[PDB]
Amino acid sequence: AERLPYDASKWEFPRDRLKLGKPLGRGAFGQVIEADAFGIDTCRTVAVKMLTHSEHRALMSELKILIHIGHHLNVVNLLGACTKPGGPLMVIVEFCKFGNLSTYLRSKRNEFVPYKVAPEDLYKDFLTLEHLICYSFQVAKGMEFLASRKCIHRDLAARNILLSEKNVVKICDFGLALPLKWMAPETIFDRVYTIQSDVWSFGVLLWEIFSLGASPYPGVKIDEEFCRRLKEGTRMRAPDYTTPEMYQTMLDCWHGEPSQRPTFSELVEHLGNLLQANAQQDRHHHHHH
Ligand SMILES: O=C(Nc1ccc(Oc2ccccc2)cc1)c1cccnc1NCc1ccncc1
């Protein structure tokens, strides 16, 4: 991280061109605030992370990595940073107006239909299978992108996915780069973090999307036993809005042996086909009715 460089000439942004706003989050390090940036791109709304020695290098490493990784439609885009003397360290990214996916889906539980048929009006701004499968496809693409760069997210979960304009989802992170319900067995017991751990987490996110924002492991005390059972083979039951192939994808992601889990590249191709098959069917449903 400290080895990666920082082209200040390309990213540095003036602190007095930012009008801080309302808090979008809080942690033990500092916070993420919404704000107006003038001329970062005119005035645009953005999200700012700001601040201990250990935490400062962590925020700088996040900045350092986002620059190294580059741009991908499904990963929060970096717009700039305030690193030169005069004020606190701030990392600036695109503002995702609609919030975290979990909270969004919980809100659309009464606005869901598997697919639409005329009069398509009864379903104005409704969620469908096409939507749910698409959010999964996109998160998988962003993870393929991150995994290709040897990047381990470590906290993949619905609360860390944000909904943008025109159903575009973006992988993000409110913290500074225990959440047991998203942690793989080897991460809980061996404290190891791998791309394969992230694949497990992707499965839980999957469950969250097709349960429409429900919390994982419904009605279960997260304790020693919970963990012992995860290690012994116990898995969540299919969520209310899942399709058979999707639940089986969840199960492949939850494989006990990390090596036997699909890679994000396989998940992209697989999810991609399901979305294609769903599209096919919706066409026929729309046509017959
Ligand atoms: O998400 C942010 N940062 C981030 C993004 C991607 C990462 O991916 C990543 C890259 C390499 C390895 C591991 C993880 C790690 C860290 C971030 C940075 C600055 C300000 N806010 C936010 N998020 C909240 C937010 C964003 C938009 N609207 C509302 C709230």
Coordinates of all heavy atoms in Angstrom, one line a residue, residues 121-180:
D121 N -48.7 -1.0 -16.6 CA -48.9 0.1 -15.7 C -49.1 -0.3 -14.2 O -48.6 0.4 -13.4 CB -50.1 0.9 -16.1 CG -49.8 1.9 -17.2 OD1 -48.7 2.4 -17.2 OD2 -50.7 2.1 -18.0
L122 N -49.7 -1.4 -14.0 CA -49.9 -1.9 -12.6 C -48.6 -2.1 -11.9 O -48.6 -2.4 -10.7 CB -50.8 -3.1 -12.6 CG -52.2 -3.1 -13.1 CD1 -52.8 -4.5 -13.1 CD2 -53.1 -2.2 -12.2
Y123 N -47.6 -2.2 -12.7 CA -46.3 -2.5 -12.1 C -45.2 -1.3 -12.2 O -44.0 -1.6 -12.3 CB -45.7 -3.7 -12.8 CG -46.7 -4.8 -12.9 CD1 -47.1 -5.4 -14.1 CD2 -47.3 -5.4 -11.7 CE1 -48.0 -6.4 -14.2 CE2 -48.2 -6.4 -11.8 CZ -48.6 -6.9 -13.1 OH -49.4 -8.0 -13.1
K124 N -45.7 -0.1 -12.3 CA -44.8 1.1 -12.4 C -43.8 1.1 -11.3 O -44.1 1.1 -10.1 CB -45.6 2.4 -12.3 CG -44.7 3.6 -12.2 CD -45.5 4.9 -11.8 CE -44.6 6.1 -11.5 NZ -45.3 7.3 -11.1
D125 N -42.5 1.0 -11.7 CA -41.4 1.0 -10.7 C -41.5 -0.1 -9.7 O -41.4 0.1 -8.5 CB -41.3 2.4 -10.0 CG -39.9 2.8 -9.8 OD1 -39.0 2.1 -10.2 OD2 -39.7 3.9 -9.2
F126 N -41.8 -1.3 -10.2 CA -41.9 -2.5 -9.5 C -40.6 -3.4 -9.6 O -39.9 -3.2 -10.6 CB -43.1 -3.4 -10.0 CG -44.3 -3.4 -9.1 CD1 -44.9 -2.2 -8.6 CD2 -44.8 -4.6 -8.7 CE1 -46.0 -2.2 -7.8 CE2 -46.0 -4.6 -7.8 CZ -46.5 -3.4 -7.4
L127 N -40.3 -4.2 -8.7 CA -39.1 -5.1 -8.8 C -39.6 -6.4 -9.4 O -40.7 -6.9 -9.1 CB -38.6 -5.4 -7.4 CG -37.7 -4.3 -6.7 CD1 -37.0 -4.9 -5.5 CD2 -36.6 -3.9 -7.7
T128 N -38.7 -7.0 -10.2 CA -39.0 -8.3 -10.9 C -37.8 -9.2 -10.7 O -36.8 -8.9 -10.2 CB -39.3 -8.1 -12.4 OG1 -38.1 -7.7 -13.1 CG2 -40.4 -7.0 -12.6
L129 N -38.0 -10.4 -11.3 CA -36.9 -11.4 -11.2 C -35.7 -10.8 -12.0 O -34.5 -11.0 -11.6 CB -37.3 -12.7 -11.8 CG -38.0 -13.7 -10.8 CD1 -38.2 -15.0 -11.6 CD2 -37.1 -14.0 -9.6
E130 N -36.0 -10.2 -13.1 CA -35.0 -9.5 -14.0 C -34.1 -8.6 -13.2 O -32.9 -8.5 -13.3 CB -35.6 -8.8 -15.1 CG -34.6 -8.0 -16.0 CD -35.3 -7.2 -17.1 OE1 -36.5 -7.3 -17.3 OE2 -34.5 -6.5 -17.9
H131 N -34.8 -7.8 -12.2 CA -34.0 -6.9 -11.4 C -33.1 -7.6 -10.5 O -31.9 -7.4 -10.5 CB -35.0 -6.1 -10.5 CG -35.7 -5.0 -11.3 ND1 -36.8 -5.3 -12.1 CD2 -35.5 -3.7 -11.4 CE1 -37.2 -4.2 -12.7 NE2 -36.4 -3.2 -12.3
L132 N -33.7 -8.5 -9.7 CA -32.9 -9.3 -8.7 C -31.7 -10.0 -9.3 O -30.6 -9.9 -8.8 CB -33.8 -10.3 -8.0 CG -34.9 -9.7 -7.1 CD1 -35.6 -10.8 -6.2 CD2 -34.4 -8.6 -6.2
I133 N -31.9 -10.7 -10.5 CA -30.9 -11.4 -11.1 C -29.8 -10.5 -11.7 O -28.6 -10.8 -11.8 CB -31.4 -12.3 -12.3 CG1 -32.3 -13.4 -11.8 CG2 -30.2 -13.0 -13.0 CD1 -33.1 -14.1 -12.9
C134 N -30.3 -9.3 -12.1 CA -29.4 -8.3 -12.6 C -28.4 -7.7 -11.5 O -27.3 -7.4 -11.8 CB -30.2 -7.2 -13.3 SG -29.1 -6.0 -14.3
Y135 N -29.0 -7.5 -10.3 CA -28.1 -6.9 -9.3 C -27.0 -7.9 -9.0 O -25.9 -7.5 -8.7 CB -28.9 -6.6 -8.0 CG -30.1 -5.6 -8.2 CD1 -31.2 -5.6 -7.4 CD2 -29.9 -4.6 -9.1 CE1 -32.2 -4.7 -7.5 CE2 -30.9 -3.6 -9.3 CZ -32.1 -3.7 -8.5 OH -33.1 -2.7 -8.6
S136 N -27.4 -9.2 -9.0 CA -26.4 -10.3 -8.7 C -25.3 -10.3 -9.7 O -24.2 -10.4 -9.4 CB -27.2 -11.6 -8.6 OG -28.3 -11.5 -7.7
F137 N -25.8 -10.3 -11.0 CA -24.9 -10.3 -12.1 C -23.9 -9.2 -12.0 O -22.7 -9.4 -12.2 CB -25.7 -10.2 -13.4 CG -24.9 -10.2 -14.7 CD1 -24.0 -11.2 -14.9 CD2 -25.2 -9.3 -15.7 CE1 -23.3 -11.3 -16.1 CE2 -24.5 -9.4 -16.9 CZ -23.5 -10.3 -17.1
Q138 N -24.4 -8.0 -11.7 CA -23.5 -6.8 -11.6 C -22.5 -6.9 -10.4 O -21.4 -6.5 -10.6 CB -24.3 -5.5 -11.4 CG -25.1 -5.1 -12.6 CD -25.9 -3.8 -12.3 OE1 -25.2 -2.7 -12.1 NE2 -27.2 -3.8 -12.3
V139 N -23.0 -7.4 -9.3 CA -22.1 -7.5 -8.1 C -21.0 -8.5 -8.5 O -19.9 -8.4 -8.1 CB -22.8 -7.8 -6.8 CG1 -21.8 -7.9 -5.7 CG2 -23.9 -6.8 -6.5
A140 N -21.4 -9.6 -9.2 CA -20.5 -10.6 -9.6 C -19.4 -10.0 -10.5 O -18.2 -10.3 -10.4 CB -21.2 -11.8 -10.3
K141 N -19.9 -9.1 -11.5 CA -18.9 -8.5 -12.4 C -17.9 -7.6 -11.7 O -16.7 -7.6 -12.0 CB -19.7 -7.7 -13.5 CG -20.1 -8.6 -14.6 CD -20.5 -7.7 -15.8 CE -21.7 -6.8 -15.6 NZ -22.0 -5.9 -16.7
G142 N -18.4 -6.9 -10.7 CA -17.5 -6.0 -9.9 C -16.5 -6.8 -9.1 O -15.4 -6.4 -8.9
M143 N -17.0 -8.0 -8.6 CA -16.1 -8.8 -7.8 C -15.1 -9.5 -8.7 O -13.9 -9.8 -8.3 CB -16.9 -9.9 -7.1 CG -17.7 -9.3 -5.9 SD -16.7 -8.3 -4.8 CE -15.3 -9.4 -4.5
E144 N -15.5 -9.8 -10.0 CA -14.6 -10.4 -10.9 C -13.5 -9.4 -11.1 O -12.3 -9.7 -11.1 CB -15.3 -10.8 -12.2 CG -14.4 -11.4 -13.3 CD -15.2 -11.6 -14.6 OE1 -15.9 -10.7 -15.1 OE2 -15.1 -12.7 -15.2
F145 N -13.9 -8.2 -11.3 CA -13.0 -7.0 -11.5 C -12.0 -6.9 -10.4 O -10.8 -6.8 -10.6 CB -13.8 -5.7 -11.6 CG -12.9 -4.5 -11.8 CD1 -12.4 -4.2 -13.1 CD2 -12.7 -3.7 -10.8 CE1 -11.7 -3.0 -13.3 CE2 -11.9 -2.5 -10.9 CZ -11.4 -2.2 -12.2
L146 N -12.5 -6.9 -9.1 CA -11.7 -6.8 -7.9 C -10.8 -8.0 -7.7 O -9.6 -7.8 -7.3 CB -12.5 -6.5 -6.7 CG -13.2 -5.1 -6.5 CD1 -14.1 -5.1 -5.3 CD2 -12.1 -4.1 -6.4
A147 N -11.3 -9.2 -7.9 CA -10.5 -10.4 -7.7 C -9.4 -10.5 -8.8 O -8.3 -11.0 -8.5 CB -11.5 -11.6 -7.9
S148 N -9.6 -10.0 -9.9 CA -8.6 -10.0 -11.0 C -7.4 -9.1 -10.6 O -6.3 -9.4 -11.0 CB -9.2 -9.4 -12.3 OG -10.2 -10.3 -12.8
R149 N -7.7 -8.1 -9.7 CA -6.6 -7.3 -9.2 C -6.1 -7.8 -7.9 O -5.5 -7.0 -7.2 CB -7.1 -5.8 -9.0 CG -7.0 -4.9 -10.2 CD -8.2 -5.1 -11.1 NE -8.0 -4.4 -12.3 CZ -8.7 -4.6 -13.4 NH1 -9.8 -5.4 -13.3 NH2 -8.5 -4.0 -14.6
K150 N -6.3 -9.0 -7.6 CA -5.8 -9.6 -6.3 C -6.4 -8.9 -5.1 O -5.9 -9.0 -4.0 CB -4.3 -9.5 -6.3 CG -3.6 -10.4 -7.3 CD -2.2 -10.0 -7.6 CE -1.3 -10.3 -6.4 NZ 0.1 -9.6 -6.5
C151 N -7.5 -8.2 -5.3 CA -8.2 -7.5 -4.2 C -9.3 -8.3 -3.5 O -10.2 -8.8 -4.1 CB -8.9 -6.2 -4.8 SG -7.7 -5.0 -5.4
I152 N -9.1 -8.4 -2.2 CA -10.1 -9.1 -1.3 C -10.9 -8.1 -0.6 O -10.4 -7.2 0.1 CB -9.3 -9.9 -0.3 CG1 -8.3 -10.9 -1.0 CG2 -10.3 -10.8 0.5 CD1 -7.4 -11.5 0.0
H153 N -12.2 -8.1 -0.8 CA -13.1 -7.1 -0.2 C -13.2 -7.2 1.3 O -13.1 -6.3 2.0 CB -14.5 -7.1 -0.8 CG -15.4 -6.0 -0.3 ND1 -15.9 -6.0 1.0 CD2 -15.8 -4.9 -0.9 CE1 -16.6 -4.9 1.2 NE2 -16.5 -4.2 0.1
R154 N -13.4 -8.5 1.8 CA -13.4 -8.8 3.2 C -14.8 -8.4 3.9 O -15.0 -8.9 5.0 CB -12.3 -8.1 3.9 CG -10.9 -8.6 3.6 CD -9.8 -7.7 4.1 NE -9.5 -7.9 5.5 CZ -10.0 -7.1 6.5 NH1 -10.9 -6.1 6.2 NH2 -9.7 -7.3 7.8
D155 N -15.6 -7.7 3.3 CA -16.9 -7.3 3.9 C -18.1 -7.3 2.9 O -19.0 -6.4 2.9 CB -16.8 -6.0 4.6 CG -17.9 -5.8 5.7 OD1 -18.4 -6.9 6.2 OD2 -18.4 -4.7 5.9
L156 N -18.1 -8.2 1.9 CA -19.1 -8.3 0.9 C -20.4 -8.6 1.6 O -20.6 -9.6 2.3 CB -18.8 -9.3 -0.1 CG -19.5 -9.3 -1.5 CD1 -19.4 -7.9 -2.1 CD2 -18.8 -10.3 -2.4
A157 N -21.4 -7.7 1.4 CA -22.7 -7.9 2.0 C -23.7 -6.8 1.4 O -23.2 -5.8 1.0 CB -22.6 -7.8 3.5
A158 N -25.0 -7.1 1.5 CA -26.0 -6.1 1.0 C -25.8 -4.7 1.5 O -26.1 -3.8 0.8 CB -27.4 -6.7 1.3
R159 N -25.4 -4.5 2.8 CA -25.2 -3.2 3.3 C -24.1 -2.5 2.6 O -23.9 -1.2 2.7 CB -25.0 -3.3 4.8 CG -23.5 -3.4 5.2 CD -23.4 -3.6 6.7 NE -23.3 -5.0 7.0 CZ -22.2 -5.7 7.1 NH1 -21.0 -5.1 6.9 NH2 -22.2 -7.0 7.4
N160 N -23.2 -3.2 1.9 CA -22.1 -2.6 1.2 C -22.2 -2.5 -0.3 O -21.2 -2.3 -1.0 CB -20.8 -3.3 1.6 CG -20.2 -2.8 2.9 OD1 -20.0 -1.6 3.1 ND2 -19.9 -3.7 3.8
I161 N -23.5 -2.6 -0.7 CA -23.8 -2.5 -2.2 C -24.7 -1.3 -2.2 O -25.7 -1.2 -1.4 CB -24.5 -3.7 -2.8 CG1 -23.6 -5.0 -2.6 CG2 -24.8 -3.5 -4.2 CD1 -22.2 -4.9 -3.1
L162 N -24.5 -0.3 -3.1 CA -25.3 0.8 -3.2 C -26.0 0.9 -4.6 O -25.5 0.5 -5.6 CB -24.5 2.1 -3.1 CG -23.5 2.1 -1.9 CD1 -22.7 3.3 -2.0 CD2 -24.2 1.9 -0.6
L163 N -27.3 1.4 -4.5 CA -28.1 1.5 -5.7 C -27.9 2.9 -6.4 O -28.1 3.9 -5.7 CB -29.6 1.2 -5.4 CG -30.6 1.2 -6.5 CD1 -30.2 0.2 -7.6 CD2 -31.9 0.8 -6.0
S164 N -27.6 2.9 -7.7 CA -27.4 4.1 -8.4 C -28.5 4.4 -9.3 O -29.7 4.0 -9.1 CB -26.1 4.1 -9.2 OG -25.6 5.4 -9.5
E165 N -28.3 5.2 -10.4 CA -29.3 5.6 -11.3 C -29.5 4.5 -12.4 O -28.5 3.9 -12.8 CB -28.9 6.9 -12.0 CG -29.1 8.2 -11.2 CD -30.5 8.5 -10.9 OE1 -31.4 7.6 -10.7 OE2 -30.9 9.7 -10.9
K166 N -30.7 4.2 -12.8 CA -31.0 3.3 -13.8 C -30.6 1.8 -13.5 O -29.9 1.1 -14.3 CB -30.4 3.7 -15.2 CG -30.8 5.1 -15.7 CD -30.1 5.4 -17.0 CE -30.8 6.6 -17.7 NZ -30.2 7.0 -19.0
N167 N -30.9 1.4 -12.3 CA -30.6 0.1 -11.8 C -29.2 -0.3 -11.9 O -28.9 -1.5 -12.2 CB -31.5 -0.9 -12.4 CG -33.0 -0.7 -12.1 OD1 -33.7 -0.3 -13.0 ND2 -33.4 -0.8 -10.9
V168 N -28.3 0.6 -11.5 CA -26.9 0.2 -11.6 C -26.4 0.1 -10.1 O -26.6 1.0 -9.3 CB -26.0 1.4 -12.3 CG1 -24.6 1.0 -12.2 CG2 -26.5 1.5 -13.7
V169 N -25.8 -1.1 -9.8 CA -25.4 -1.3 -8.5 C -23.8 -1.2 -8.4 O -23.1 -1.5 -9.3 CB -25.8 -2.7 -7.9 CG1 -27.2 -2.6 -7.4 CG2 -25.6 -3.7 -8.9
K170 N -23.4 -0.7 -7.3 CA -21.9 -0.5 -7.1 C -21.4 -1.0 -5.7 O -22.1 -0.8 -4.7 CB -21.6 1.0 -7.2 CG -21.9 1.6 -8.5 CD -21.9 3.1 -8.5 CE -22.1 3.7 -9.9 NZ -21.1 3.2 -10.9
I171 N -20.3 -1.7 -5.8 CA -19.7 -2.3 -4.6 C -19.0 -1.1 -3.9 O -18.3 -0.3 -4.5 CB -18.6 -3.3 -5.1 CG1 -19.3 -4.6 -5.6 CG2 -17.7 -3.7 -3.9 CD1 -18.4 -5.5 -6.5
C172 N -19.2 -1.0 -2.6 CA -18.6 0.0 -1.8 C -18.1 -0.5 -0.5 O -18.0 -1.7 -0.3 CB -19.6 1.2 -1.6 SG -20.8 0.9 -0.3
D173 N -17.8 0.4 0.4 CA -17.3 0.0 1.7 C -17.4 1.2 2.6 O -16.6 2.2 2.5 CB -15.9 -0.5 1.6 CG -15.5 -1.3 2.9 OD1 -16.4 -1.5 3.8 OD2 -14.3 -1.6 3.0
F174 N -18.3 1.2 3.6 CA -18.4 2.3 4.6 C -17.3 2.3 5.6 O -17.0 3.3 6.2 CB -19.8 2.2 5.3 CG -20.9 2.8 4.5 CD1 -21.5 2.0 3.5 CD2 -21.4 4.0 4.7 CE1 -22.5 2.4 2.7 CE2 -22.5 4.5 4.0 CZ -23.1 3.7 3.0
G175 N -16.6 1.2 5.8 CA -15.6 1.1 6.8 C -14.2 1.5 6.4 O -14.0 2.0 5.3
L176 N -13.2 1.2 7.2 CA -11.8 1.5 6.9 C -11.1 0.2 6.5 O -10.8 -0.7 7.3 CB -11.1 2.1 8.1 CG -10.4 3.4 7.8 CD1 -11.5 4.4 7.3 CD2 -9.7 3.9 9.0
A177 N -10.8 0.1 5.2 CA -10.2 -1.1 4.6 C -8.7 -1.1 4.9 O -7.8 -1.0 4.0 CB -10.4 -1.1 3.1
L178 N -18.4 -9.3 15.5 CA -17.9 -9.7 14.2 C -19.1 -10.0 13.2 O -20.1 -10.5 13.6 CB -17.0 -10.9 14.2 CG -15.5 -10.7 14.2 CD1 -15.1 -9.6 15.2 CD2 -14.8 -12.0 14.4
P179 N -18.9 -9.6 11.9 CA -19.9 -9.9 10.9 C -20.0 -11.3 10.5 O -19.8 -11.7 9.4 CB -19.4 -9.0 9.7 CG -17.9 -9.1 9.9 CD -17.7 -9.0 11.4
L180 N -20.2 -12.2 11.6 CA -20.3 -13.6 11.5 C -21.2 -14.2 10.4 O -20.9 -15.3 9.8 CB -20.6 -14.2 12.8 CG -19.6 -14.0 13.9 CD1 -20.0 -14.7 15.2 CD2 -18.2 -14.6 13.5

